[PDB]
């Protein structure tokens, strides 16, 4: 039925610019408004701007100067031009659709809201470039410390340890590095059994495996 | 063009009165019909009414519930809705079509060419 | 742009979100998944949201209510309100299970040789545990250290609801060959005193 495809989304310099596409299909494009929702990672939901085909247009004030929405009528997609990015624009960026005069529509006992929303596209800015991980041994684990960008799997002896096994979320370094531990809990008798943790880094082709 | 008035947060069982004012060269329009959309739904014909006979022609979902009127002393349509469900919460918009269709397709939103803005009902449980 | 707000429940709970000015609309969202509609003008329910879901006005608030609470009904809830050109989303309610408290099991691990050669060192000090509120002191020499360190913790586990943290103390090789005993202080609701795992170089 009604689907919302997001496209576009990469990594950028700070100070560059990209544009991103919400290729809509399967409903009256002119009879609706596309909104832009973007989310930092691990806050909340953050409206950007929005396009009623029209081009009733409105941004949100942390991004009034150096952001630009438009549309094509033709291709029922919506386009959002970012310029200037900066560290703060890092998050993930939906788009949904709405009425298509929500502004007149709004009251005070009404509010249709967003009814259908993409899976939205990642877009990082950042200066750094990309780099593979250091693999080092540390229950016990491996620390992967200092590669850009997301993401990695940490997997052990190939899969095969995966109960009791944690993997931290990555903590962006004050460097512009992410960095993560992989721990597991195993039995003290099986210590002198060996322990690998597999890393994969996809965006640098990079395949480390350490035994602990 | 076409403003709708009226509606608001209605109980369920209640009745509301819309009304749609039409301004300018009506005498060319073929049908007068009201629309609603809902949030997930896809925009629906509900009621139309033939200008040049006064015929009206309503949707199975509206039957024996809604009426619709035209007061040509002033152009303005009527959309009465009486025994209220929370299934009619949408936003009832007044649509126009100056080019004519026959009474199978009245009821569809590709055959009319005119909207108005809308105004939104809620049936607040 | 903040960090949504936290809410134990169990399974069967009735759960009340206040939203704090046009109507509000409620959203429910999954970790890593697009968010979904659930009430629209106040108190009007969405297409496929089960009745348990209710939305109502009370004076100038807008509260989102959960009759019965369900197992697939924990994540995070948004209210979106509409002014006259913005769209605002509040701050969120993230929903979690309820579960009894539990201790940590504290680890440290020195950093290996493999890492001294590159210039920089880093400790790390591993915490299963509930409630989420937890602190972790770092402690070089007896002296408490603040700023160089960064905390990370898991989502809450889909068998046994616990939390799992690490905090990784950062430091140049330089700096690591200067002192000796390396101690990181952990504090939890579970334990009646702290606890202090820790090592010399
Ligand atoms: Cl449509
Ligand atoms: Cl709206």
């Known amino acids: 039925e009604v689907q919302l495809v997001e496209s576009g989304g990469g990594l950028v310099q700070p100070g560059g610019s990209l544009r991103l596409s919400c290729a809509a299909s399967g409903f009256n494009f002119s009879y609706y408004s596309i909104h832009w929702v973007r989310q930092a990672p691990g806050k909340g939901l953050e409206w950007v701007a929005y396009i009623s085909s029209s081009s009733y247009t409105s941004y949100a004030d942390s991004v009034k100067g150096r952001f630009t929405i438009s549309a094509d009528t033709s291709k029922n997609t919506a386009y959002l031009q970012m310029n200037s990015l900066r560290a703060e624009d890092t998050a993930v960026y939906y788009c949904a659709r709405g009425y298509q005069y929500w502004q007149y529509h709004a009251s005070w006992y009404w509010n249709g809201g967003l009814d259908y929303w993409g899976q939205g596209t990642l877009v990082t800015v950042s200066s750094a470039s990309t780099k593979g991980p250091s693999v080092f041994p540390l229950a016990l684990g491996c620390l992967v410390k200092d590669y850009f960008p997301e993401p990695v799997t940490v997997s052990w002896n190939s899969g095969a340890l995966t109960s009791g096994v944690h993997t931290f979320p990555a903590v962006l370094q004050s460097s512009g590095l992410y960095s993560l531990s992989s721990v597991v809990t195993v039995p003290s008798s099986s210590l002198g059994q060996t322990y690998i943790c597999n890393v994969n880094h996809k965006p640098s082709n990079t395949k480390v495996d350490k035994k602990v | 063009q076409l403003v709708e008035s009226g509606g608001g947060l209605v109980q369920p069982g209640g009745s509301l009165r819309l009304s749609c004012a039409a301004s300018?060269?009506?005498?060319?329009?073929?049908?007068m019909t009201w629309f609603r959309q809902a949030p997930g739904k896809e925009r629906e014909g509900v009621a139309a009414?033939?200008?040049?006979?006064?015929?009206?022609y309503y949707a199975d979902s509206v039957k024996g519930r809604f009426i619709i009127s035209r007061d040509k002393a002033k152009n303005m349509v009527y959309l009465q809705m009486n025994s209220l469900e929370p299934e009619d919460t949408a936003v009832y918009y007044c649509?126009?079509?100056?080019?004519?269709?026959?009474?199978?397709?009245?009821?569809?939103?590709?055959?009319?060419?005119?909207w108005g803005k809308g105004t939104p009902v809620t049936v607040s449980s | 742009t903040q960090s949504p707000s936290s809410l134990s429940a169990s399974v069967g709970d009735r759960v009340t979100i206040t939203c704090r000015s046009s109507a509000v609309a409620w959203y429910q969202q999954k970790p890593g998944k697009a968010p979904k509609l659930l009430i629209y003008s106040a108190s009007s329910l969405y297409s496929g949201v089960p009745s348990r879901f209710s939305g109502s006005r009370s004076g100038t608030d807008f509260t989102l209510t959960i009759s019965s609470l369900q197992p697939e009904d924990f994540a995070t809830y948004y209210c979106q309100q509409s002014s006259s050109s913005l769209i605002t989303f509040g701050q969120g309610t993230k929903v979690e299970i309820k579960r009894t408290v539990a201790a940590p099991s504290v680890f440290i691990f020195p950093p290996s040789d493999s890492q001294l050669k590159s210039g920089t060192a880093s400790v790390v000090c591993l915490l299963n545990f509930y409630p989420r509120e937890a602190k972790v002191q770092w402690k070089v020499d007896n002296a408490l250290q603040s700023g160089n360190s960064q905390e990370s913790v898991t989502e809450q586990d889909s068998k046994d609801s616990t939390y799992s943290l690490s905090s990784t103390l950062t430091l140049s090789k330089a700096d690591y060959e200067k002192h000796k005993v390396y101690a990181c202080e952990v504090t939890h609701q579970g334990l009646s005193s702290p606890v202090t795992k820790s090592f010399n170089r």
């Open positions: 649509g126009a079509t100056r080019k004519y269709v026959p009474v199978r397709f009245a009821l569809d939103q590709s055959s009319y060419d005119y």
């Open positions: 300018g060269s009506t005498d060319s329009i073929e049908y």
């Open positions: 009414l033939y200008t040049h006979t006064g015929n009206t």
